[PDB]
Design a protein around this ligand. Structure first.
Ligand SMILES: *[C@@H]1O[C@H](CO[C@@H]2O[C@@H](C)[C@@H](O)[C@@H](O)[C@@H]2O)[C@@H](O[C@@H]2O[C@H](CO)[C@@H](O)[C@H](O)[C@H]2NC(C)=O)[C@H](O)[C@H]1NC(C)=O
Ligand SMILES: *[C@@H]1O[C@H](CO[C@@H]2O[C@@H](C)[C@@H](O)[C@@H](O)[C@@H]2O)[C@@H](O[C@@H]2O[C@H](CO)[C@@H](O)[C@H](O)[C@H]2NC(C)=O)[C@H](O)[C@H]1NC(C)=O
Ligand SMILES: CC(=O)N[C@H]1[C@H]([C@H](O)[C@H](O)CO)O[C@@](O[C@@H]2[C@@H](O)[C@H](O)O[C@H](CO)[C@@H]2O)(C(=O)O)C[C@@H]1O
Ligand SMILES: *[C@@H]1O[C@H](CO)[C@@H](O[C@@H]2O[C@H](CO)[C@@H](O)[C@H](O)[C@H]2NC(C)=O)[C@H](O)[C@H]1NC(C)=O
Ligand SMILES: O=C(C[n+]1ccccc1)NNCc1cc(C(O)O)nc(-c2ccccc2)n1
Ligand SMILES: [Cl-]
Ligand SMILES: [Cl-]
Ligand SMILES: [Cl-]
Ligand SMILES: [Cl-]
Ligand SMILES: [Cl-]
Ligand SMILES: [Cl-]
Ligand SMILES: [Cl-]
Ligand SMILES: [Cl-]
Ligand SMILES: [Cl-]
Ligand SMILES: [Cl-]
Ligand SMILES: [Cl-]
Ligand SMILES: [Cl-]
Ligand SMILES: [Cl-]
Ligand SMILES: [Cl-]
Ligand SMILES: [Cl-]
Ligand SMILES: [Cl-]
Ligand SMILES: [Cl-]
Ligand SMILES: [Cl-]
Ligand SMILES: [Cl-]
Ligand SMILES: [Cl-]
Ligand SMILES: [Cl-]
Ligand SMILES: [Cl-]
Ligand SMILES: [Cl-]
Ligand SMILES: [Cl-]
Ligand SMILES: [Cl-]
Ligand SMILES: [Cl-]
Ligand SMILES: [Cl-]
Ligand SMILES: [Cl-]
Ligand SMILES: [Cl-]
Ligand SMILES: [Cl-]
Ligand SMILES: [Cl-]
Ligand SMILES: [Mg+2]
Ligand SMILES: [Mg+2]
Ligand SMILES: [Mg+2]
Ligand SMILES: [Mg+2]
Ligand SMILES: [Mg+2]
Ligand SMILES: [Mg+2]
Ligand SMILES: [Mg+2]
Ligand SMILES: [Mg+2]
Ligand SMILES: [Mg+2]
Ligand SMILES: [Mg+2]
Ligand SMILES: [Mg+2]
Ligand SMILES: [Mg+2]
Ligand SMILES: [Mg+2]
Ligand SMILES: [Mg+2]
Ligand SMILES: [Zn+2]
Ligand SMILES: [Zn+2]
Ligand SMILES: [Zn+2]
Ligand SMILES: [Zn+2]
Ligand SMILES: [Zn+2]
Lengths: 535, 533
């Protein structure tokens, strides 16, 4: 096959033809887009890859950036599907290009995927991110990249030149630049690049909206279950510094006491850092991750809540959404009395405790605010309800309301915004019933995984996934997911700050609903901040 | 006939026969129970009436205690019905007694009614308190008395022998003492006396529950749409002196013995005409002269008493109407009136929140506003109207009543709760007000049975039912019929299950939680808010 030998600005590539049941797709895997960030380059922003001679074996996936590996449920499908699926290395700055089998003769739009995993984990090599199905069925180019996570991507000593912070975001930016110079080689259009990501990926997309040097590297944006204004997505310079120096003391970094500091971190082996990374966190918590983007004033000019309020958003098109049960997955990772194996029927006492790990580091009074605002004062002792109630607390505080805040403020300032709630449970789904439609289980449907001859998805689901892939494809093509000029009754209307319409994505045709937990998010976006400042 | 001549401890009375569609009834109206609290005895606790020669003309209602007479809607039934229907007088400490025409040979239980009216108005002679239908139908004895209101009842310079506070409450207690000693002359049993009262009447009942010297004059309590722990029913010592001292400056009065001496020199009418001028801000369910926490009557704040009280051996019947708030909005909330639809703007609504929960922080009022704003329809006027009607209803009546009920029940009382949900076919208020505060009273008293008032045949049955609930409770402390399992049962209210019944023309219906979710904000969070701010 001739379509498998392509040349980018840095040298020659050898690709691999992939099979799908609809027809083939040609793909390039593990293209090196940066110089490997190793030894003295650890913690330093990425440097573009020096051009090479020969051909690059771009036929398999490259390594996974060093990260924590979840040991909670050994060999359990639900946890393991996210665990690294390649070898770990700090040599991990590589990206992947899928493109329709006969390379499109006309410039087609490009979809860049950014994986999530709370900025401490994840990898473009994961099976649920296989782009062959999206690219085969909607003939668009797809690109995904690896980026440094955990300390390797976000340990920061604000103001140091040695751990400048946000190097994982620069990793992403570099890749987007690569897309600008090189996607034209694969039939893609550098003037039609649409970013999409889930969890911290969605937060990542968000900060690219809010950082000017990225704003000319794409044109549309899809944020799935994540937002840059999340309570978990950013950290102040003072905290960043404190957390970083803690890791150094926690790993033994003794006798300027700031450039000396990072050299010692630069000697410790990668695993030893990963080991002590979760101890750095301020208080016991869930949905909180040690090393995240810092608000330094370089990459993030101000807090995201500030940058959203007065941004440059007119003409932007944004697709935005959540799953139905955004909190339940995190509850088994810290809330007392929670397992995937029992019904998680907690007590009042356990519910109260879980509130203070769900909403960590707020005043005692603000904790009471939540506790009273989420109890069902008619059935306050009911374990079933207390469970689901804490699920709402965690889901609302971290995902739903920060996303809802983002949607209205963009729409206010003249972004064309479309919003969904994914509310369909995969028949395959391995997590227990009480977790509902959990964080991250819209992804496989967006990527058309139900078309895989291997897996055991349903007839009903095959068509559903094709419907989702079209929505996302229509979006990346045109800034509007709506089936272009369709008299068929379902019609997905844009999200305004007033009416606040969104669609329900499930096996039934789109329902148009008003208000993304409107009453609940009034508490979190409007009232709660007043408590926090005024007491 | 010789059944209308009765001799109580202090002399002879001559009463009157009242005709009822079901038979006649003997009444004794205007029985003096206290030496007239005049001249030097103004603001002083009542003195027991000394015995008299001859026979007292007990054949018509005595005078109404001096008070503000409402003139918001002059000539309108909805307001005139609460206004004085007798002459105003400081010579007003009388009581009334209804009793079955064949005077009961067996000692029969006593209902004692205490009227309401914000502790500033009211009279036992009002037509919706006519006791004749109760006794004729359920064959009980009904007693009502007047008690001083306004400054005459509750002006206090706490401490001073001269204006010690709460004499209106002591007025009530003295009349109960009269009941203990004299009810038996009319057929009544002094060992089954049930207190019931509405609005400030209900708060009074609550305060007798918490005042040890009163808690031997009755055995059961019925609180309708009011509670002693409400935000309007008591003031602090410092605040009450602050108000009494202002009224004295308003009226031209230059030391505390001095001050009260000068106030005693003023025509009663002159005081009345400055009463509202004394309140400390624009308000909509607040009154100038109310019970005070002196230490004598209430040995501590009403809430403090409830929390630490033991109530084993008490049965309490308790309830609210469907829309407690709507009535008070036309008395100062911006944009309301009985005569249009009262579709308020949002800004009208945010201003209404400040007058409806007055004297709380900015943050506090904010909290109220994001708890009562519907954030999918933040500017719908109709929704904004019913929100305000909830804000003042919940904060002033419902959540205080529910909070008292959970405590009494959890601490040894047997409690029964209702929500009154019927709108009289004759109601003169506009429709948006719903079931307004005070408009179950006619049904409790069986007024639909008066042939002249034009109620429904259905509506008459409804009132009989209610009367039987109330008599039954007075008789035995259980509103249910004893020999009727199959009758729709009214179960006791408890702190967890929180069951009440709905009184309307549908048969008993059981619901959970008296605005349980709303009331958590009021009874549980907002306190913690004003504390840590
Ligand atoms: C539901 O499960 C949790 C998890 O407890 C255990 O986790 C495994 C490691 C194993 O030991 C299993 O037996 C359990 O599923 C329960 O919470 C724990 O309960 C134990 C004793 O009851 C206690 O020592 C732990 O501290 C608890 N964990 C906390 C508080 O985070 C929970 O009680 C289970 N609910 C049931 C069985 O109804
Ligand atoms: C609804 O009515 C209120 C109250 O006004 C009374 O009833 C009206 C039918 C009208 O005839 C008024 O004169 C009555 O006094 C309206 O609010 C009033 O508006 C006037 C305008 O100058 C103002 O001076 C008053 O202070 C207002 N009253 C209050 C209590 O704020 C209101 O505008 C009417 N309309 C709506 C839509 O609510
Ligand atoms: C050191 C730091 O905090 N930021 C860097 C960053 C890095 O060089 C990184 O490699 C970005 O991928 O780059 C910054 O400015 C850039 C230019 O150096 C580049 O030639 O063109 C870019 C166009 O998007 C961009 O303007 C940045 O992104 O802020 C600045 C700084 O050197
Ligand atoms: C306020 O001043 C009055 C004066 O009118 C004080 O009343 C005194 O009472 C005694 C009898 O106990 C009499 O001799 C006079 O009436 C008054 N004496 C004087 C010297 O004024 C009253 O005690 C004062 N009130 C206080 C201090 O609370
Ligand atoms: O309860 C009533 C009548 N009733 C009595 C018993 C049961 C049911 C109803 N009537 N309530 C008047 C009221 C309330 C308020 C408000 O402040 O509470 N204000 C005023 C007012 C009067 C003159 C000048 C200014 C204000 N009148
Ligand atoms: Cl390579
Ligand atoms: Cl080094
Ligand atoms: Cl190799
Ligand atoms: Cl083509
Ligand atoms: Cl743009
Ligand atoms: Cl923020
Ligand atoms: Cl800080
Ligand atoms: Cl800071
Ligand atoms: Cl240094
Ligand atoms: Cl290493
Ligand atoms: Cl356009
Ligand atoms: Cl939802
Ligand atoms: Cl329960
Ligand atoms: Cl429910
Ligand atoms: Cl379709
Ligand atoms: Cl809807
Ligand atoms: Cl909603
Ligand atoms: Cl008559
Ligand atoms: Cl006389
Ligand atoms: Cl005589
Ligand atoms: Cl008899
Ligand atoms: Cl006494
Ligand atoms: Cl109180
Ligand atoms: Cl006070
Ligand atoms: Cl005058
Ligand atoms: Cl006036
Ligand atoms: Cl507002
Ligand atoms: Cl303030
Ligand atoms: Cl009992
Ligand atoms: Cl009829
Ligand atoms: Cl409720
Ligand atoms: Mg900080
Ligand atoms: Mg710093
Ligand atoms: Mg140490
Ligand atoms: Mg604190
Ligand atoms: Mg509790
Ligand atoms: Mg799956
Ligand atoms: Mg909601
Ligand atoms: Mg006596
Ligand atoms: Mg004070
Ligand atoms: Mg003056
Ligand atoms: Mg607003
Ligand atoms: Mg309560
Ligand atoms: Mg009427
Ligand atoms: Mg019973
Ligand atoms: Zn995940
Ligand atoms: Zn609340
Ligand atoms: Zn525009
Ligand atoms: Zn004057
Ligand atoms: Zn609230």
């Amino acid at each position: 096959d001739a379509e498998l030998l392509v040349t980018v600005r840095g040298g020659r590539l050898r690709g691999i033809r992939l099979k799908t049941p609809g027809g083939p797709v040609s793909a390039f895997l593990g293209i090196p887009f940066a110089e490997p960030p190793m030894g003295p380059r650890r913690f330093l922003p990425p440097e573009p890859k020096q051009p090479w001679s020969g051909v690059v074996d771009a036929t398999t996936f490259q390594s996974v950036c060093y990260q924590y590996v979840d040991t909670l449920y050994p060999g359990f499908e639900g946890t393991e599907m996210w665990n690294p699926n390649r070898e770990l290395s700090e040599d991990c700055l590589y990206l992947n290009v899928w493109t329709p089998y006969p390379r499109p003769t006309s410039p087609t739009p490009v979809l860049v995927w950014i994986y999530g995993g709370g900025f401490y984990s994840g990898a473009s090599s994961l099976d649920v991110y296989d782009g062959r199905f999206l690219v085969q069925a909607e003939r668009t180019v797809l690109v995904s990249m690896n980026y440094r996570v955990g300390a390797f991507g976000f340990l920061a000593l604000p103001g140091s030149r040695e751990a400048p912070g946000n190097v994982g975001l620069l990793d992403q930016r570099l890749a987007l630049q690569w897309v600008q110079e090189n996607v034209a080689a694969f039939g893609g259009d550098p003037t039609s690049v649409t970013l999409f990501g889930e969890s911290a990926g969605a937060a990542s997309v968000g900060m690219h909206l809010l950082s000017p040097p990225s704003r000319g590297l794409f044109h549309r944006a899809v944020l799935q279950s994540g937002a840059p204004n999340g309570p978990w997505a950013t950290v102040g310079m003072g905290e960043a510094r404190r957390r970083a120096t803690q890791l150094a003391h926690l790993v033994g970094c003794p006798p300027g006491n700031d450039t000396e500091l990072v050299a010692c971190l630069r000697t410790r082996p990668a695993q030893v850092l990963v080991n002590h990374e979760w101890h750095v966190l301020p208080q016991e918590s869930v949905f909180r991750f040690s090393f995240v983007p810092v608000v330094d004033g370089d990459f993030l000019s101000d807090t995201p809540e500030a940058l959203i309020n007065a941004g440059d958003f007119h003409g932007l098109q944004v697709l935005v959404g959540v799953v139905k049960d955004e909190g339940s997955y995190f509850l088994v990772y810290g809330a007392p009395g929670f397992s995937k194996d029992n019904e998680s029927l907690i007590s009042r006492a356990e519910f109260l405790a879980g509130v203070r790990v769900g909403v960590p580091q707020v005043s005692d009074l603000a904790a009471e605010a939540v506790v009273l605002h989420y109890t069902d004062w008619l059935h306050p002792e009911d374990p079933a309800r207390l469970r689901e109630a804490l699920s709402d607390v965690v889901g609302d505080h971290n995902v739903v309301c920060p996303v809802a805040q983002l949607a209205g403020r963009l729409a206010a300032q003249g972004a064309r915004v479309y919003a969904y709630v994914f509310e369909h449970r995969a028949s395959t789904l391995s997590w227990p019933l009480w977790m509902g439609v959990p964080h991250g289980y819209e992804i496989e449907f967006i990527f058309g995984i139900p078309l895989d001859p291997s897996r055991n998805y349903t007839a009903e689901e095959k068509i559903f996934a094709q419907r989702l892939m079209r929505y996302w494809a229509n979006f990346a093509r045109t800034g509007d997911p709506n089936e272009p000029r369709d008299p068929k009754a379902p019609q997905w209307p844009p999200y305004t700050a007033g009416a606040q319409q969104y669609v329900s994505l499930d096996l039934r045709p789109l329902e148009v609903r008003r208000g993304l937990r409107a009453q609940a998010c009034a508490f979190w976006n409007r009232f709660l901040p007043k408590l926090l400042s005024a007491t």
